[PDB]
Amino acid sequence: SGFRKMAFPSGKVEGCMVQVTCGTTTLNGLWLDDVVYCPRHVICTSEDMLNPNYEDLLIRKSNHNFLVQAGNVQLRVIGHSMQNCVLKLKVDTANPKTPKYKFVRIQPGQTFSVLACYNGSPSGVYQCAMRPNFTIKGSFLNGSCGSVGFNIDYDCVSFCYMHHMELPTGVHAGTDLAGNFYGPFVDRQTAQAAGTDTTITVNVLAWLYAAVINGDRWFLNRFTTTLNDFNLVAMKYNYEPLTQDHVDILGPLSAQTGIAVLDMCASLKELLQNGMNGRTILGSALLEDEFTPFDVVRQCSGVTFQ
Amino acid sequence: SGFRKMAFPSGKVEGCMVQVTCGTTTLNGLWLDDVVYCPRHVICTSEDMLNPNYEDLLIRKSNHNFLVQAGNVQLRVIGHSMQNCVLKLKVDTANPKTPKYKFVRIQPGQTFSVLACYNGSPSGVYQCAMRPNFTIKGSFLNGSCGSVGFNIDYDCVSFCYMHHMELPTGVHAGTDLAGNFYGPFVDRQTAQAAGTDTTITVNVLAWLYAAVINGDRWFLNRFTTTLNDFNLVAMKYNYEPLTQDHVDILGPLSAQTGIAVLDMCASLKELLQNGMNGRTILGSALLEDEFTPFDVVRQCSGVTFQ
Numbered sequence A, B: 001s002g003f004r005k006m007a008f009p010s011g012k013v014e015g016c017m018v019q020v021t022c023g024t025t026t027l028n029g030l031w032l033d034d035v036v037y038c039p040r041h042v043i044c045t046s047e048d049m050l051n052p053n054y055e056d057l058l059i060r061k062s063n064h065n066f067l068v069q070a071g072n073v074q075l076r077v078i079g080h081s082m083q084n085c086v087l088k089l090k091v092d093t094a095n096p097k098t099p100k101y102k103f104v105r106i107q108p109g110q111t112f113s114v115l116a117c118y119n120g121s122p123s124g125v126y127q128c129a130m131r132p133n134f135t136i137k138g139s140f141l142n143g144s145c146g147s148v149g150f151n152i153d154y155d156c157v158s159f160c161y162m163h164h165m166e167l168p169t170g171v172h173a174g175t176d177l178a179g180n181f182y183g184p185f186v187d188r189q190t191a192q193a194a195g196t197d198t199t200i201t202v203n204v205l206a207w208l209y210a211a212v213i214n215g216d217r218w219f220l221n222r223f224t225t226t227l228n229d230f231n232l233v234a235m236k237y238n239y240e241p242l243t244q245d246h247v248d249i250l251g252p253l254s255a256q257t258g259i260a261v262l263d264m265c266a267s268l269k270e271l272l273q274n275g276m277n278g279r280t281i282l283g284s285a286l287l288e289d290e291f292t293p294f295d296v297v298r299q300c301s302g303v304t305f306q
């Protein structure tokens, strides 16, 4: 037993991290087969950032302007292209450590592991959620751009995030691996703000099922509630609406604990209305929303990857 | 910016995990050079667990009783020995993925990353502390024994923990990699209990410095306090004593934030006496104690590993 904020094992991704240098800018890139993916603002200069036109910054570069380090080995760029907000640098060598992989664009509420990197070298791994406002609450310093977020499914790495920038509230914005920003953000140093965030209700319910699986039951109660009456309470406390689809997804957890989804909703209602009153759940004094139903089942039943 | 419960990149350790099977028992082992390390209770049978004498369970085994899987490859055991509570299986093949490594026995309060594994395959990674009562609050199911805890220092993996058993409060006990239990625990299924735990005070102070580095300052105040007067408050709230040595270790953080250690202690005092009163620190509504001063500096300045 026990319940931890668990990240996927990171080795498959560590083998893909490289350093990309252009001008005075160094960041991380992702080397899969013979292509290195990285944020396109690597081609920006210090004066170039209020309203850059990337289609030249790029038409003005030559391949030899791109310095790619794979550890103790320089990789030669033989071509470059831009796809939305990511650069793709064609190099003359295929990454022999290339895992089985997919690029996926995730929905808000979905979680993923982030391998934070500087100068092509991994620094740490942690677990994140895509917030409803399409930011992630990450841990990123200068040089971490191009670090990627990912999930692993048996043997396949599904990359879903690459890091680009930090917003004034200290939260983070980036793209999928095909270069499309999550949320309304753009890669230009102009006024931008996160927008109002909300709590991921289906994930909170999943984490309460995790708690029950692990022996915390103090928050359960008699009651039930309807979906409508639950969603009226959620909306006051700035929680995302719970859909019938969320309910079905919570089915396996409901069935394993014997607590109907709508009963767990009644418990969450009283937690929102009364608070926790000096008690904790799974070592937390807040309602945690960065575990999906799948994360809970994965961690509480022991799914592996190879 | 941002602050996350960060684990070390796990790839160097993933390359060392193997499956060990003996009789009806399957668990994980750690394959470094030509030796596989695993818990010695792998040689116990279902009837053998109330007071086993391992010196035979072992004298009765032959090498061919040990089934070791390195993925799709069976490893042949050519020798075995017991060191305290770990088995060492000499195999005929050296692990080519063997990193630079050390075995270290850590002090309570020190943190480490755990690569949770089942059947030799990694399941997830997370960050733990050795509690003052020498348990760890892990996430472990049947089959996770032999999963290891570790730190990374530039290029070197310092292994510090291997998992053995779960105590009735849902917390976990195990050994260093030379087989010595942390705490008073023994590998026999007889009555054992964790003992009273306490909060790791030096780590709480480090996490408050992390908060200041990251823009949470609401908890700072006028006051100062003496070490003695702080420790009188800590003892009432079941906190570990703060030593002058802890104070010196907190020096770099003190110097980077401009907040004297003893001033941060005055802040922690008021947090203990008044609570947080509906406010959070670094996304937590509790005082967090599983970041060391070194973790804070590592994450807030961007140290990497290669």
Ligand SMILES: *[C@H](O)[C@H](C[C@@H]1CCNC1=O)NC(=O)[C@H](CC1CCCCC1)NC(=O)[C@@H](NC(=O)OCc1cccc(Cl)c1)C(C)C
Pocket (backbone or CB within 6 Å): A027, A041, A044, A049, A140, A141, A142, A143, A144, A145, A146, A164, A165, A166, A167, A168, A172, A186, A187, A188, A189, A190, A191, A192, B001
């Ligand atoms: C890349 O490694 C780096 C990572 C961040 C640095 C600190 N934490 C990070 O996650 N990214 C950056 O430094 C970007 C540079 C590019 C260059 C031009 C194209 C877009 C950004 N800069 C930022 O993240 C800055 N934030 C930012 O510009 O956000 C929008 C914005 C713009 C103007 C004015 C405001 Cl108030 C906000 C950071 C302030 C460094």
Ligand SMILES: *[C@H](O)[C@H](C[C@@H]1CCNC1=O)NC(=O)[C@H](CC1CCCCC1)NC(=O)[C@@H](NC(=O)OCc1cccc(Cl)c1)C(C)C
Pocket (backbone or CB within 6 Å): A001, B027, B041, B044, B049, B140, B141, B142, B143, B144, B145, B146, B164, B165, B166, B167, B168, B172, B186, B187, B188, B189, B190, B191, B192
């Ligand atoms: C190995 O993969 C497994 C991992 C644990 C299973 C559930 N979570 C885990 O971390 N370890 C075990 O199953 C051990 C087996 C050995 C075999 C004999 C030598 C010592 C233990 N068993 C346990 O962890 C059990 N706990 C336990 O025995 O703790 C002390 C104890 C003993 C007697 C009575 C009490 Cl109340 C407590 C678990 C209960 C499975």
